[PDB]
Design a protein around this ligand. Sequence first.
Ligand code: CL
Ligand code: CL
Length: 113
Amino acid sequence: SHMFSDCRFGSVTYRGREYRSDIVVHVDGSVTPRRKEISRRKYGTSHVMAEEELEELLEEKPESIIIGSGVHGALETGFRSDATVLPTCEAIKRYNEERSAGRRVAAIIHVTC
Ligand SMILES: [Cl-]
Ligand SMILES: [Cl-]
């Protein structure tokens, strides 16, 4: 069962483990740290997400990419894509939805504003 089971400022729980930093959820259920440097190098801040951040996910050929824009959704997207951007606590619900339905879903979650 690859589900998020908790969302709150500064923290989300995925597959029984709490993450207090931004994370990338891969199609297979794996979790890796969000690569904030990609965006910091391109924009001078990681508050604007570079499309390059999605590049590692595009390889897994997901049917849907969900982006948790954070708690209070301050984080902004610097591109147009099929990816679904939603406030984090709304993003995890949507992820659980699709994952529950069996969809190849991947996500990038921002735990703060
Ligand atoms: Cl982490
Ligand atoms: Cl950030």
